């Protein structure tokens, strides 16, 4: 993938070694203000289930308040995704 390559160069630049691990929760992440719990990548990093995230993880206000991000390596924007014949009586359309 793209972030696996990036992480390879992240380890090269940091010099450290890395083990590529997926998030079980399969979420970029967010926090429940009631449970005080973090989910997904941020949940993993905020809880210590890991130590670093060279992945398509997104910086945002809520997660920064409780964990440390890096300098954004790419920008993005919200967007919308959607699902991408003559009638029997089409002769009345004119």
């Amino acid at each position: 993938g793209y972030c696996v390559d990036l992480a390879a160069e992240i380890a090269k630049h940091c010099g450290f070694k890395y083990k590529l691990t997926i998030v079980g929760d399969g979420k970029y992440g967010a926090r429940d203000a009631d449970t005080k719990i973090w989910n997904g990548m941020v949940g993993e990093l905020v809880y210590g289930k890991a130590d670093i995230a060279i992945a398509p993880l997104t910086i945002t206000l809520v997660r920064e308040e409780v964990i440390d991000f890096s300098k954004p390596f790419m920008s993005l924007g919200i967007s919308i995704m959607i699902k991408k014949k003559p009638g029997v009586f089409s002769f009345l359309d004119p």
Binding site: K85, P86, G87, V88, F89, S90, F91
Partner: peptide, 10 residues
């Protein structure tokens, strides 16, 4: 025929 099927049905 699909375009003019309605007229045949009628």
């Amino acid at each position: 025929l699909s375009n003019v099927a309605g007229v045949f049905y009628i």
